[PDB]
Amino acid sequence: KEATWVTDKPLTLKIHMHFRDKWVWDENWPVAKESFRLTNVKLQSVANKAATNSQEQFNLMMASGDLPDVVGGDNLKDKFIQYGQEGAFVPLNKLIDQYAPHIKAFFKSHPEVERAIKAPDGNIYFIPYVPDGVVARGYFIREDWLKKLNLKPPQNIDELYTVLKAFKEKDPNGNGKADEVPFIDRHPDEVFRLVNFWGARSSGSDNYMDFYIDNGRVKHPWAETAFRDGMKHVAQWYKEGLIDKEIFTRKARAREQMFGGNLGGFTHDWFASTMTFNEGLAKTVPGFKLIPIAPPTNSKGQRWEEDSRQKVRPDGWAITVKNKNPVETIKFFDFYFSRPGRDISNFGVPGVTYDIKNGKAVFKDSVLKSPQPVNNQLYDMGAQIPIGFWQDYDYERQWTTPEAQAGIDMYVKGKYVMPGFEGVNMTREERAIYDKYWADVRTYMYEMGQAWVMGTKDVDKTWDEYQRQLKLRGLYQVLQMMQQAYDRQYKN
Amino acid sequence: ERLWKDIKRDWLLYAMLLPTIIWFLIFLYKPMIGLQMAFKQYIGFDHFVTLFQSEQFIRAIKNTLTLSGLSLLFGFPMPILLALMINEVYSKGYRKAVQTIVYLPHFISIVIVAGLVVTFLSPSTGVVNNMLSWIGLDRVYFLTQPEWFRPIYISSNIWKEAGFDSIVYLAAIMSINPALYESAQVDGATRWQMITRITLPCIVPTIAVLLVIRLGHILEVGFEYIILLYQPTTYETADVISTYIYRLGLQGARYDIATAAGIFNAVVALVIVLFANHMSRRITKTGV
Amino acid sequence: MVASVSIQNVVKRYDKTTVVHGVSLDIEPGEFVVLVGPSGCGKSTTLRMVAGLEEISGGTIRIDGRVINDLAPKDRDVAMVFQNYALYPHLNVRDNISFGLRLKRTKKSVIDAAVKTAADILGLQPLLERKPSDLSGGQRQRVAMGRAIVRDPKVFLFDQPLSNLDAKLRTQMRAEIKRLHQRLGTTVIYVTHDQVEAMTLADRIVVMRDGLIEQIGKPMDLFLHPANTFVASFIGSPPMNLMPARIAVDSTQHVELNGGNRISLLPRAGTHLAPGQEVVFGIRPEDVTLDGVEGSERAQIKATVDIVEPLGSESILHATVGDHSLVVKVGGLNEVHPGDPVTLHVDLTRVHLFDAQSQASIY
Amino acid sequence: MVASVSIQNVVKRYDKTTVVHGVSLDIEPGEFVVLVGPSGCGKSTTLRMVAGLEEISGGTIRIDGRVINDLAPKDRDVAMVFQNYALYPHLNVRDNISFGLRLKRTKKSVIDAAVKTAADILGLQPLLERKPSDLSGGQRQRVAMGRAIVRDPKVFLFDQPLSNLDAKLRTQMRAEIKRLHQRLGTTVIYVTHDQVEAMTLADRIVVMRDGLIEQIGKPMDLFLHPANTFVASFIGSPPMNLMPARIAVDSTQHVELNGGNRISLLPRAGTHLAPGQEVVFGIRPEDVTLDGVEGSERAQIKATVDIVEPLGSESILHATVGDHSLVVKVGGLNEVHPGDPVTLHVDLTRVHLFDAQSQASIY
Amino acid sequence: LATPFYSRSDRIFGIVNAVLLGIFALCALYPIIYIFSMSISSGAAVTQGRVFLLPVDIDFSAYGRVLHDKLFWTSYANTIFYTVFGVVTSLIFIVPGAYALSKPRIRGRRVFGFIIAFTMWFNAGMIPFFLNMRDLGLLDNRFGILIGFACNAFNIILMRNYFESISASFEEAARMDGANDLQILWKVYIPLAKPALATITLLCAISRWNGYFWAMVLLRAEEKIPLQVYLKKTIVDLNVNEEFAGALLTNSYSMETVVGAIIVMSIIPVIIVYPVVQKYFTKGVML
Numbered sequence A: 001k002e003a004t005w006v007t008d009k010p011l012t013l014k015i016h017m018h019f020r021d022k023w024v025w026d027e028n029w030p031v032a033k034e035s036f037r038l039t040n041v042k043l044q045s046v047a048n049k050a051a052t053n054s055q056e057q058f059n060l061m062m063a064s065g066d067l068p069d070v071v072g073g074d075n076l077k078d079k080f081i082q083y084g085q086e087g088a089f090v091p092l093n094k095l096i097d098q099y100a101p102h103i104k105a106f107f108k109s110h111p112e113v114e115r116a117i118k119a120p121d122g123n124i125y126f127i128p129y130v131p132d133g134v135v136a137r138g139y140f141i142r143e144d145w146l147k148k149l150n151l152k153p154p155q156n157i158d159e160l161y162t163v164l165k166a167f168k169e170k171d172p173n174g175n176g177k178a179d180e181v182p183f184i185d186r187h188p189d190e191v192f193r194l195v196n197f198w199g200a201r202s203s204g205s206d207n208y209m210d211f212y213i214d215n216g217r218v219k220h221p222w223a224e225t226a227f228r229d230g231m232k233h234v235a236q237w238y239k240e241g242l243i244d245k246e247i248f249t250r251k252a253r254a255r256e257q258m259f260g261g262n263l264g265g266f267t268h269d270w271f272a273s274t275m276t277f278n279e280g281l282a283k284t285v286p287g288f289k290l291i292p293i294a295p296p297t298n299s300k301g302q303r304w305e306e307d308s309r310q311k312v313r314p315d316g317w318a319i320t321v322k323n324k325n326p327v328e329t330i331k332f333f334d335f336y337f338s339r340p341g342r343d344i345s346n347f348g349v350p351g352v353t354y355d356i357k358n359g360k361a362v363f364k365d366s367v368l369k370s371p372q373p374v375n376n377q378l379y380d381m382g383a384q385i386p387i388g389f390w391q392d393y394d395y396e397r398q399w400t401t402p403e404a405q406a407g408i409d410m411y412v413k414g415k416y417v418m419p420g421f422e423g424v425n426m427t428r429e430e431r432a433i434y435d436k437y438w439a440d441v442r443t444y445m446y447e448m449g450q451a452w453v454m455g456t457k458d459v460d461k462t463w464d465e466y467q468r469q470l471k472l473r474g475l476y477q478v479l480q481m482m483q484q485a486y487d488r489q490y491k492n
Numbered sequence B: 001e002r003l004w005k006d007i008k009r010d011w012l013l014y015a016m017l018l019p020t021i022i023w024f025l026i027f028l029y030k031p032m033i034g035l036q037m038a039f040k041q042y043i044g045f046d047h048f049v050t051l052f053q054s055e056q057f058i059r060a061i062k063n064t065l066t067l068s069g070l071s072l073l074f075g076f077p078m079p080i081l082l083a084l085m086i087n088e089v090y091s092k093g094y095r096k097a098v099q100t101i102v103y104l105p106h107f108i109s110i111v112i113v114a115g116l117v118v119t120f121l122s123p124s125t126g127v128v129n130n131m132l133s134w135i136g137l138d139r140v141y142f143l144t145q146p147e148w149f150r151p152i153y154i155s156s157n158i159w160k161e162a163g164f165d166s167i168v169y170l171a172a173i174m175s176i177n178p179a180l181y182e183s184a185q186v187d188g189a190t191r192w193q194m195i196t197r198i199t200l201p202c203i204v205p206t207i208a209v210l211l212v213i214r215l216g217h218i219l220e221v222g223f224e225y226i227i228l229l230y231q232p233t234t235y236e237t238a239d240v241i242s243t244y245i246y247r248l249g250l251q252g253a254r255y256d257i258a259t260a261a262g263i264f265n266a267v268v269a270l271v272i273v274l275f276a277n278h279m280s281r282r283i284t285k286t287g288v
Numbered sequence C, D: 001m002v003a004s005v006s007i008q009n010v011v012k013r014y015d016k017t018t019v020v021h022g023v024s025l026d027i028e029p030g031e032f033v034v035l036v037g038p039s040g041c042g043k044s045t046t047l048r049m050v051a052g053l054e055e056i057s058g059g060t061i062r063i064d065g066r067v068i069n070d071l072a073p074k075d076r077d078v079a080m081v082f083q084n085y086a087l088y089p090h091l092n093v094r095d096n097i098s099f100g101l102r103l104k105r106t107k108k109s110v111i112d113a114a115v116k117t118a119a120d121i122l123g124l125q126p127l128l129e130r131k132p133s134d135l136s137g138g139q140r141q142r143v144a145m146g147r148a149i150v151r152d153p154k155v156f157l158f159d160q161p162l163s164n165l166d167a168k169l170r171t172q173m174r175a176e177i178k179r180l181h182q183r184l185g186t187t188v189i190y191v192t193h194d195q196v197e198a199m200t201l202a203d204r205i206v207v208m209r210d211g212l213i214e215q216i217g218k219p220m221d222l223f224l225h226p227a228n229t230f231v232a233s234f235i236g237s238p239p240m241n242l243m244p245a246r247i248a249v250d251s252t253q254h255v256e257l258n259g260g261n262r263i264s265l266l267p268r269a270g271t272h273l274a275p276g277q278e279v280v281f282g283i284r285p286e287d288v289t290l291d292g293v294e295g296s297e298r299a300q301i302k303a304t305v306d307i308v309e310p311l312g313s314e315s316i317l318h319a320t321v322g323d324h325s326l327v328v329k330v331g332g333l334n335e336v337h338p339g340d341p342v343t344l345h346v347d348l349t350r351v352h353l354f355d356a357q358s359q360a361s362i363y
Numbered sequence E: 001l002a003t004p005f006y007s008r009s010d011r012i013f014g015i016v017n018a019v020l021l022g023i024f025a026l027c028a029l030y031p032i033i034y035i036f037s038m039s040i041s042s043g044a045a046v047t048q049g050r051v052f053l054l055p056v057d058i059d060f061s062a063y064g065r066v067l068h069d070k071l072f073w074t075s076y077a078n079t080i081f082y083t084v085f086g087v088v089t090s091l092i093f094i095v096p097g098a099y100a101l102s103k104p105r106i107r108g109r110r111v112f113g114f115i116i117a118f119t120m121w122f123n124a125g126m127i128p129f130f131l132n133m134r135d136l137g138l139l140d141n142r143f144g145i146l147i148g149f150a151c152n153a154f155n156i157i158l159m160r161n162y163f164e165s166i167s168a169s170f171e172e173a174a175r176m177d178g179a180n181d182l183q184i185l186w187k188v189y190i191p192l193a194k195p196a197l198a199t200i201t202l203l204c205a206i207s208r209w210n211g212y213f214w215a216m217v218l219l220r221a222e223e224k225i226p227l228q229v230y231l232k233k234t235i236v237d238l239n240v241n242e243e244f245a246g247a248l249l250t251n252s253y254s255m256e257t258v259v260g261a262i263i264v265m266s267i268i269p270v271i272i273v274y275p276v277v278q279k280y281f282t283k284g285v286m287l
């Protein structure tokens, strides 16, 4: 028996969790075993680990007719609302009230967090993931490649263009080839974010391809006529080889390849995990130094950082109607908002990854001295996964390098950070339009975007046809509906 | 009558025939019963119009026809050609080695073949682009380029299936009695004169049956390859009716329109194989 | 084209197995010569070596002055008729006949006149537009001979052409072949597993066994005077009896055999046989009768009837002398029946004797 | 076991047409009867109907008292020898023989006497342990007959057993069959496409063509007195010469031929010939001779020699009178040349005449 | 064919034939040996444009990576299971049915022949077949994959045709000896059918082994998954966890070498069993 037990009798449940097209839930996970010993609830994962796309597996599991006990994952928020309304997911509201003190207290202390996850009816069908922090992404560049190539770090777009040109043409790594790739990243969508250098928005929030509020009017960054101006130039950057050719396909292994093979000169990504590499591969790559840099002056004469860390996110887990045990499950979810739950969901397993020091969890030397980023280890261990847990920023502060913190403070002090997009509250009638159309819309946008970047089609020639296709796809219906939801809230 | 009379002795034979027939009634004709269903929801006779009016499906059937023509023109004759070339080879050891090497890739899995395609053609990494760099000509990302999709596919195809399909033809030209060749030798017929004047018209019915078998589907050609290696940028030229039916039906979980397209595809395949069989019946020796 | 063909010490080897050994035969122009023997010998291999279908591993063969050894079959000026169906199924009969001339296509009126003459000779005129799909076997062999003669070669080679047909068809085609040679008169080599075709068709018969040529000569030379016990056993409709025998007491006059029987012998000057010598004595079934010679001179052999098979107006009588049995052709009535003793009358002029060790006749 | 088998009005029908029509034959115990005819026919179908491998569409057939019409082949108490030898290549020879017996009982029956007698009759001691893979054809048919006799049935059924063997092997196997039937003596029905085997083996020959039974009777009864022109043309070593003929002035006395030739005829009461009647006149090749040797004698004919084929001490002479040619056996020792006229003497007692229309035997 | 040698045009023809066929053969062999070489070689070399035909720094570590994979060997065992039992059930459903369809006397011979043959040129579809699998409850089932397809009309008509090619004298003699139906089939027809059996079991073997799609669709649980599906994840899709990416630098084998090693370990049994199979099916001059 334990004090953290949500049930006296051992509870084994079937959970289908497929997220980020990489990991599936594992009951043999150290974090999961810890969670089982603490909560007296065992989560058995029914999923295909050999599967690739997560959203596809979600749709398949849903349309299979046979529902598991708990459904977790990422970007399932809208789907959580759809099937929550359709009756596939049980409303947790009163369960949260009576049986989940920590969750209720959190939503009480965070009304703006609770508001976003609410259905048109107001019910909460899922316990979400709430990342803690301020900054999200910032630009990074090689220190040594600026020196031996004899040039000062770029203050603007032109200087950056000349720097990347000097990376591709002149040989910065001294191997004697042109093989080095100026721009890389482990997020393909970042290839669009480059349009910020020309003053174009790639999104409205942390989530890629998201609407934003411009002077009280809801608008999509991609549908705007200032988007293809930047898309042209980044397509030129690909054409010049300034951008990674595999940048769409390479994905997660990017930073561990280009930087490890010393082929990369520039990236975006995030502060901590990127700055971890400096210490990590320092023994392999002799002269490697990666430094944080300001968001260089755009064509608009401004300093733009489009990505900030959003409160909560479209992530989490929900309870199906076939669960038969709503109480133990909602209490199990309540456990992850508790201090020990946060401890095991962030810092991993005590006695292995971290120890308890004066009330605060501190990672072991084994974890901190590892070349591989801590979060990448916790992923494999079952921690920092997009479950209903509350993130603890201290865990990130521990392995954050002083230069990374300096870059963070630089971005905060510089106020390059843009305000995030909170979203709107839609009624049940106007929600269906978004739910049905927006998926196909953003799929189309991403496919055409990838077609533009790689230079398969032409930006200018296919621009009008693209606009008309967006018109017939029903995008502007969702847009005007979003304006219908927005204008009722913010007036003055 | 004689029904019960012969059945009494034929009993065990029908007991052998029973599980197979039942198997076919279950796993084959029952989904045909399901084919007559799903044609209505969600009655009926409607979503076909959605199929014909959609820009996606029309390019799907477009590239289905295109891939059919390409695979038929380039892919089908190659096994025959291989068989003819191997047939002309003396020094039984060398011919044996050739047979081993050429028949080998058939046993390679389709996912492994596709993996070989993506590995060989990977930019800055794959051997192909490296050999292109050694001669010093450009470089190419192949799988992201639609233009290269079809030439790659069939190539891989004629790498994998050429020899194994050449086995049948080789066995067909080895079934010819030597006298036909030797008498022509007495008359002083050329090698090419022999392969053209006798060997080929002797192997004609075999290649005809194998042709109406090839034309038996031809809409489903390279489905498992396409569903594997088709990139979002190459989605345009790579898409085939079978791939459409899969993506909407199995993935997108839309059973109605997918079943409709399935019925359409099966019907057209039946028509084209009926025509093919007829023309390979009247004109060509034997047939179905 | 009438031409001679000389075969000198030819030998064919397959993987050092030596199929045929030192075969030598000379063939005069327009002469009918038949290679005949059991399965396995190199007579078909010899014919094919003349055709050029098989390589010559040694010795030299030539037509007239020119040596065809390194020559191509096209240039060998020969035409071969294969035993199994050498006509192509997709082409018509006329196309099958003209097939050889269509290679260089020649002149159109040349193949037209050629196929005309050929079809007139073999009666392939109505079959001209017919296809090999529906045809008789004999008709296929006939059109085969048509394209054979349409080349107008120096030598006609035949490899067991009638082997795939029925006995009646074999006979009819045999007569037609003889007639055909009576017409054209071209030099022709003929291969047979059958003795009958050899006896009827050949101007000269050459027997071949295990690659070794056993004997040559006219049909009647082989029939009346076989060189050995094998040749003796080969030619004729019934096999020659050939049972062991001895001499002992009297040498040139009498010779005795197994059943305790004793047979007197004609003087036959030039023999000089020796007494006590182990021998194999044989006689033809046509030369033995049942009480045929009335009060015969020397009192011929006695035996015991085994079985009786009527063939017709004639009959085949199996008689047993001691542990050995001899066959005798008899009349169509022949009450007989098995188990009862019987007296056989042997013709003294037709008797044959061969040495027990040396297969040679010596008699 | 010697037992009779009666076949009464048995008929087999396939779709539109019918292969056999109302065939009726009675077979005495231990009697040898041979069904003989052309390729397509119902003799094999009849034998198969006796075997029970094929259904009886009408009529009744029985062995002794038991009616076998409705029966299992196992209980039919017959043993059949197939043309394809019916022996399994995977099983041993002894296993092939005992294959039928391996179903019931065991070594309790001792099994030894059966296989001993069976292998001893056909005389194969060493072949007891062997596989069909390596064997001669005759050995395969021999072991097949081994499994035939190992059943010890009432009836031995034979379907073209010697068809797959060479003439040399065929004759020997024929003799062995004759000896076998003379030894065991069980009732046996035999099917052949060959006339020779029918003549030799059968106590009674029954000819069948494209239908029911053409004729029955002993071999010499068929040879001497054929019922029609087909039976006449079939039986014999050579085929019977059959040429068209007519009658003009005198009826029973004279018969005329193509070349302006005229033949006197013996009266032979029971004929009833008609003058002016279109006829087909036949004669055996053995019954014709050359010119003035025997006498006037029984008839005379003038002809022109076509071709001469020596077989041996005998010879086959093809002679042409009108547009039709007749064959005559002559000695091999009498020189004959082609193209020159020749005189043939026909034996008047052995001549045959048939109606041109009815085909039935007239004279 | 025949062996005249002789004529010049024929000589040149044969030579250029051997040359072209040789070139094509080398084109066929090159990828496999490239995969072996690259899988053996180092990640650095492979990444730098080294290797091609021959190995370079011979890392050997990639195999060390694939050997520590649990799901790989699990899926391997799954493919073995599917091949063995799949082939077994296949033969069980085919051979007696083809032997029944072979014999000339059957009532529904025509209509049964039609029932089996019709499936060739007309099929219901992907989706209705999947739904058919759903209603039977064979989804996510090993037996659902086994009995899912044990039969193709091709194998049936092939086995039937080869059964008909066998002389009826054997069956008839068996019936004369008292053997009826089944006891015949086992004792004579089957050992006479050895080559046809070999062909069918071969086609079924490679079908079960190299089959991926329907095995991927009908199955969910990772422990039931076959090799080709896991390969479909790793070899083509090439998506990877941050674990593997982080394990790329601490190892020094590349992803390419890992893939190469994987498909090497995948095709090894094929390369092993191929000579025996082919040499069996030849037994003579080529063919």
Ligand SMILES: O=C(O)[C@H]1O[C@@H](O[C@H]2[C@H](O)[C@H](O)[C@H](O[C@H]3[C@H](O)[C@H](O)[C@H](O[C@H]4[C@H](O)[C@H](O)[C@H](O[C@H]5[C@H](O)[C@H](O)[C@H](O)O[C@@H]5C(=O)O)O[C@@H]4C(=O)O)O[C@@H]3C(=O)O)O[C@@H]2C(=O)O)[C@@H](O)[C@@H](O)[C@@H]1O
Residues within 6 Å of the ligand: A019, A020, A021, A053, A054, A055, A056, A074, A075, A131, A187, A208, A269, A270, A271, A272, A273, A274, A375, A384, A396, A439, A442, A443, A444, A446
């Ligand atoms: O990096 C740091 O240092 C800090 O990182 C913190 O964790 C971060 C990670 O670093 C990543 O930023 C992570 O981003 C996730 C993201 O949350 C999603 O889960 C995303 O999922 C994507 C899918 O894998 C897939 O690519 C999908 O494709 C779409 C396509 O774009 C289009 O829409 C089409 O129509 O549909 C397909 C489809 O299949 O859905 O897009 C998804 C998308 O949303 O991008 O994967 C990324 C990822 O990088 O894998 O977020 C976490 C986080 O929790 O914030 C943390 O460790 C901190 O301590 C570190 O310091």
